[PDB]
Amino acid sequence: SAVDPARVDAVVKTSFTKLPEGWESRLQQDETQRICSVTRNNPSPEQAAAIMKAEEVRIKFPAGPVLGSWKDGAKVAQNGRGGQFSDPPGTVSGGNCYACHQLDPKEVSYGTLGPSLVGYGRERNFSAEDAKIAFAKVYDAQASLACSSMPRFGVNGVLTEQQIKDVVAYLFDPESPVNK
Amino acid sequence: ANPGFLNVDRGEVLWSEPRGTRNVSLETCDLGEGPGKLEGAYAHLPRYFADTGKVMDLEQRLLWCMETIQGRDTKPLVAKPFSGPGRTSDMEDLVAFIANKSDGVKIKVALATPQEKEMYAIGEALFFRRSSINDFSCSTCHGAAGKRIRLQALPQLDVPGKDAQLTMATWPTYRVSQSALRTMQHRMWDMYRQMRMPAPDYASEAVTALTLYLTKQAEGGELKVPSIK
Ligand code: HEC
Ligand code: HEC
């Protein structure tokens, strides 16, 4: 095979010299970043399985319930700023679901890289349990699907427990435009 | 017919214009297709240059010329490679012009040495490489067909074929939403920026590694440069 060497590290190490304070870490892959890259996001069955084992343990669930605030969850969904070097200090991060998902059926700007989430809660009978599944999906998706293209929001420090509570509510709160 | 024809004619100036301690122009700068010869040189870039011993894009090449031929102080340019309101980029204008000397030509990079095949590989790797707080890779958003981010459709770049050809045929380009002509460098910067990565080094190895991959997946693409977007 065209065995691609560890010459990829240097090329990054040496080509990424302007670093905001404490960003050397953003270059080093974690073990589930590394497998997904070396196999072009096509894990083998065994590959996928090990990831899941390491990812689903990293999931912390809230002390209280899953549901939060759908009105404030809508704000997490639309915000596409956060985490960037171009981003001024204090910039509140979002999940930006709209970039990849259809959410509010009424809304006309949405991506198709991810699944339609229109009526998600209603389609799942508003089940409190299936919302736990949607929580752990936002907190860490690679816990349920290895090498998935959805960001591991909650395990990577982009989303706070409360933001996930809020964005899940947007999928699950019967009174949300997503569920209407 | 296109506001990006300023940069075209601003790049024509700087190519003609003697500069540096040696105070000569870049009219004798070799871009791969022989000294001075501008025809098709971008359609065959990035490539290996014997005078350095590496693979090189258009900008890394221009900059080399500025150093040795002209003797121009490049340090202010690697610092402000991307133009602003009320301030040009002599690195985006010389790309417009040189790119236009490859207009109507077909994209045709070739893996011909140990250096270029190695580079392409590493660019393929960097294309797939997941890293940082959003876990993104270029292949996350360029890893299939018929996909769109919000309303903007995504070009497939993980395979040879249409999208890629058309893409590298539409770069460098003019974006009205900024009202500025932009080069592959800036796009590379913008995408790593929005991947939550650190800001890549202008004219670095990684950027040029990616470009070769993108350009090799773009083989056959008939340059129509610089475009309107
Ligand atoms: C960078 C792309 C991306 C972004 C951003 C993103 N998603 Fe996803 N999402 C995907 C993809 C691709 C899948 C399918 C693979 C999977 O199961 O992980 C998915 C799956 C899901 C699913 C399960 C889909 C199903 O089949 O039932 C849910 C629910 C979901 N995402 C919610 C969210 C929420 C909430 C956000 C905002 C916090 C978000 N997504 C942001 C790409 C994305
Ligand atoms: C945020 C998701 C996202 C990621 C991550 C991403 N892309 Fe893009 N890409 C897009 C979108 C959306 C556009 C359309 C913007 C435009 O071209 O004006 C685009 C456009 C492009 C274009 C120009 C397309 C054209 O014809 O105008 C190139 C080249 C490109 N991407 C390559 C890359 C590379 C290389 C990377 C890795 C540094 C990358 N992309 C990462 C979503 C993404």
Q: Considering only CB atoms, which chain A residues are within 8 Å of B211? A: none
Q: Which helix H or strand E contains A42, and what residues bound it?
A: none
Between chain A and chain B, how many beta carbons pairs sit less than 8 Å apart? 124
The CA distance from A69 to the nearest CA of chain B, in Å, is 23
For atom 24 of ligand 2, which residue has the closest CA? B167
What is the CATH number that goes with domain B5-104? Answer: 1.10.760.10
CB A164 within 8 A of CB A139: yes
Q: Assign 3-class secondary structure to chain B.
A: CCCCHHHHHHHHHHHHCCECCCCECCCCCECCCCECCCCCHHHHCCEEECCCCEEECHHHHHHHHHHHHHCCCCCCCCCCCCCECCECCCCCHHHHHHHHCCCCCECCCCCCCHHHHHHHHHHHHHHHCCCCCCCCCHHHHCCCCCCEECCEECCCCCCCCHHHHHHHCCCCEEECCCCEEECHHHHHHHHHHHCCCCCCCCCCHHHHHHHHHHHHCCCCCECCCCEEC
Residue A120 is labelled as binding a ligand? yes
Ligand 1 centre distance from Cα of residue A78 (Å) = 14
- Interface test mutation site (partner A, options B117, B135, B138, max chain A beta carbons within 10 A): B135
CB B87 within 8 A of CB B2: no
The CA distance from A28 to the nearest CA of chain B, in Å, is 7
Nearest ligand to the CA of A168 is: 1
What residue has token string 């994209």? B107
Q: Which is nearest to B197 in space by CA: A32, A10, A20, A158?
A: A20
Residue A101 is labelled as binding a ligand? yes
Q: Which helix H or strand E contains A97, and what residues bound it?
A: none
Q: Which is nearest to B205 in space by CA: B138, B146, B126?
A: B126
Q: Where are the domains of chain A?
A: 1-180
Cis peptide before A20 (omega within 30 of 0): no
Q: Considering only CB atoms, which chain A residues are within 8 Å of B197? A: 16, 26-27
Do A11 and B205 count as a contact with CB atoms less than 8 A apart? yes
d(CA B129, CA B126): 5
**Tokens linked to A167:** 């964005």
Ligand 2 centre distance from Cα of residue B191 (Å) = 6
Ligand 1 centre distance from Cα of residue A150 (Å) = 5
DSSP label at residue A104: S
Q: Where are the domains of chain B?
A: 1-4+105-229, 5-104
Q: Resolution of the coordinates in A?
A: 2.2
Looking at the CA of residue A168, tell me the nearest atom of ligand 1: 35
For atom 14 of ligand 1, which residue has the closest CA? A114
Do A29 and B130 count as a contact with CB atoms less than 8 A apart? yes
Identical fold between B1-4+105-229 and B5-104: yes
Domain covering B1-4+105-229 assigned CATH 1.10.760.10 in the classification: yes
Chain breaks in chain B (C to N over 2.5 A) after: none
Q: What are the residues whose beta carbons fall under 8 Å from the beta carbon of A159, sequence distance 6 or more?
A: A76, A93, A95, A138, A139, A153, A167
Looking at the CA of residue B163, tell me the nearest atom of ligand 2: 26
Looking at the CA of residue B140, tell me the nearest atom of ligand 1: 1
Nearest to B149 among A16, A27, A99 (CB): A99
Report the interhelical angle of B184-194 vs B205-216 (nearest 10°): 110
Nearest to A26 among B124, B133, B149 (CB): B133
CATH of range A1-180; options 1.10.760.10, 3.30.40.10, 3.90.550.10, 3.40.47.10: 1.10.760.10
Nearest to A109 among B133, B151, B204 (CB): B151
d(CA B139, CA B217): 13
